[PDB]
Design a protein around this ligand. Structure first.
Ligand SMILES: [Mg+2]
Length: 624
């Protein structure tokens, strides 16, 4: 049945409130249920969704969108509720800001007048830069140019909501009940039963129903156990797709029976990295026992040669092999914060341009290759030479060796313990345990969140280094680089740093240089090739200074599938461009072969690079 997608869901959905929530387990559902202004085609271009047309002013400050006449709201049973109107986009922003949406930073500094609204005693919302010119016309006025603004509209904080429905539901809006939202997307939510089932049905009156091929989507809850049985459901025809997991027991027969069908998904939008804490104050989780050890570690992590030595000794493949497969460990490798083909810079990839700038920082970077799916960094001799320089500098400063580094893990993630033990093993093998000792702090999930992700302030980060990630949310290198800026970077805290109190240490680390590189790049909003080259300078600075050490992406997982490759909508950012968007997806009767996938990927790489060209000039025609 090529009209029924049957699979599983393994996360715990918590809310359908697409305006206030941006958690992946929730957006994977509501992207099928609610449309925004734009969506993505299968090549990554922004294309019409609820908006059939759009324009931008010459100064880049005013975006206007024309809603299509048959954009409609439906209740979950499929009955028409009301046409979508431009005021619904005003309602959405006011509601998202008044209730402090998880995604508010996407718009707070972007829409004109919004930051003042969130701080006036009675700041009137009619001063905010979102307006319904008439029923079919929504107009956004921005506080500064944002060449990436349209890509933001694929995030659900920018989706519309009908005010009368919103007001009538009140506290019952956007729960886990299908009737707690209205539907404007390709599907209706026919069922949601917590920890058992999600079912979508194609909306036959959706404006783009003729483009929707999958009529039924059935997802069964997968609780993480008994991995050996979803392949059996693939063979029987009960499932359209089946993951192939190293943590399983039937692997042998699976890999070999499906050796010519196992395909790997594209690397997705989460950039994982290791980072240092260079301003540690919290020592509730340490194997160090003396003030002198803590002083030695604090001085070491401030030494750039020391951080680079760790960087060159961190074997990313061995870490990836523990969580994923050792065969497929290389599929997820990532060497930059900004994925190396995230944008093109003229004839070159972003990663090629970053490499050209990075070589200027030192002979240790000569020949560096930052491409995906290989480890750019690991190099024993480079690590040992860097450490020897660091040890001379640090000994001269009064430090005692070996340097002990604490890293915390959630002990309930088996991939996390085995992964960090691999990092300990490799670092100590390469640099020597008379030089460095990695002390893994196994913690409960609650304690692990308290030392890092949920640490109340920068001063509460309780580790010397950590493994962490960033999800990009708009189509510009700054989405990955801005969080680490020294004026107001949201993620300065992961380094233990606060912009005001640690201004001196921030300057001494060179982060003012990084921050000025980002400002200079953001200034370029007419020539994107020049804009992106300037962001490459900042990415190269970050790599050289090794406060962040890029490691891997998400995605890149093995499966057998009946999904015809490269037909679904696709994007690097937003929620309309991942494997959870069934609208453009097509199913086939026969299992995809590795050979078919290779030919489809080459065809897609040709057509995508070309269509992105035709799409840009296309956007030059929308400048009004
Ligand atoms: Mg039900």
């Amino acid at each position: 049945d090529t009209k029924t997608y049957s699979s599983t869901f393994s996360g715990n959905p918590t809310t359908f409130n697409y305006l206030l929530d941006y958690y992946a387990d929730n957006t994977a559902i509501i992207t099928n249920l609610v449309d925004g202004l734009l969506e993505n085609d299968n090549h990554g271009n922004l294309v019409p969704s609820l908006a059939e047309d759009w324009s931008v002013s010459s100064d880049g400050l005013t975006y206007t969108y024309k809603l299509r006449k048959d954009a409609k709201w439906f209740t979950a049973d499929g009955e028409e509720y009301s046409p979508v109107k431009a005021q619904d986009f005003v309602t959405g922003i006011k509601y998202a800001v008044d209730n402090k949406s998880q995604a508010i930073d996407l718009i707070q500094n972007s829409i004109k007048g919004l930051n003042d609204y969130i701080t006036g005693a009675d700041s009137d919302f009619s001063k905010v830069g979102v307006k319904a010119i008439d029923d079919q016309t929504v107009e956004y006025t921005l506080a500064r140019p944002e060449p990436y603004w349209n890509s933001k509209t694929t995030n659900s904080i920018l989706f519309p909501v009908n005010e009368e429905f919103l007001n009538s539901k009140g506290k019952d809006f956007g729960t886990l009940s299908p009737d707690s939202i209205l539907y404007s997307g390709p599907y209706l939510l026919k069922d949601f039963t917590s920890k058992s089932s999600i079912e979508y049905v194609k909306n036959p009156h959706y404006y783009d129903h003729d483009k929707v091929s999958i009529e039924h989507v059935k997802l069964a809850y997968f609780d993480g156990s008994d991995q050996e049985l979803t392949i059996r459901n693939f063979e029987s025809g009960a499932y359209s797709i089946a993951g192939v997991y190293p943590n399983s027991s039937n692997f042998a027969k699976t890999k070999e029976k499906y050796k010519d069908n196992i395909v790997y998904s594209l690397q997705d939008k989460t950039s994982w990295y290791f980072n240092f804490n260079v301003n540690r104050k919290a020592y509730n989780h340490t194997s160090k026992t003396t003030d002198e050890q803590k002083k030695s570690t604090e001085t070491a992590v401030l030494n750039k040669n020391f951080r680079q030595a760790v960087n060159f000794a961190l074997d990313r493949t061995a870490y990836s092999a523990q969580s994923n497969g050792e065969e497929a460990a290389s599929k997820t490798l990532l060497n930059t914060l900004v994925p190396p083909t995230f944008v093109q810079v003229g004839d070159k990839t972003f990663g090629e341009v970053v490499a050209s700038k990075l070589v200027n920082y030192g002979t240790e970077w000569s020949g560096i290759n930052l491409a995906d799916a290989q480890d750019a960094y690991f190099n024993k001799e480079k690590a040992q030479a860097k450490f020897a320089e660091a040890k001379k500098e640090l000994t001269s400063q009064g430090v005692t060796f070996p340097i002990h580094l604490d890293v915390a893990v959630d002990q309930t993630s088996k991939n996390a313990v085995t992964g960090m033990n691999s990092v300990k093993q490799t670092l100590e093998s390469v640099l020597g345990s008379d030089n460095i000792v990695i002390d893994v702090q196994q913690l409960s999930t609650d304690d692990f969140n308290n030392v890092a992700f949920l640490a109340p302030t920068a001063a509460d980060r309780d580790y010397d280094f950590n493994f962490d990630g960033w999800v990009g949310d708009y189509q510009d290198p700054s989405t990955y680089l801005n969080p680490f800026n020294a004026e107001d970077g949201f993620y300065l805290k992961i380094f233990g740093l606060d912009a005001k109190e640690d201004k001196e240490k921030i300057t001494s680390l060179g982060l003012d240089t990084y921050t000025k590189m980002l400002k200079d790049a953001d200034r370029e909003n007419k020539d994107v090739a020049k804009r992106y080259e300037k962001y490459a300078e900042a990415q190269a600075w970050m790599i050289d200074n090794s406060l962040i050490m890029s490691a891997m992406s998400s995605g890149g997982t093995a499966s057998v599938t009946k999904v015809t490759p490269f037909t679904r909508g696709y994007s690097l950012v937003g929620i309309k461009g991942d494997g959870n968007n069934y609208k453009y997806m097509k199913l086939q009767k026969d299992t995809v072969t590795t050979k078919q996938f290779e030919e489809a990927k080459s065809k897609w790489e040709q057509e995508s690079k070309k269509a992105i060209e035709k799409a840009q000039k296309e956007a030059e025609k929308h400048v009004k």
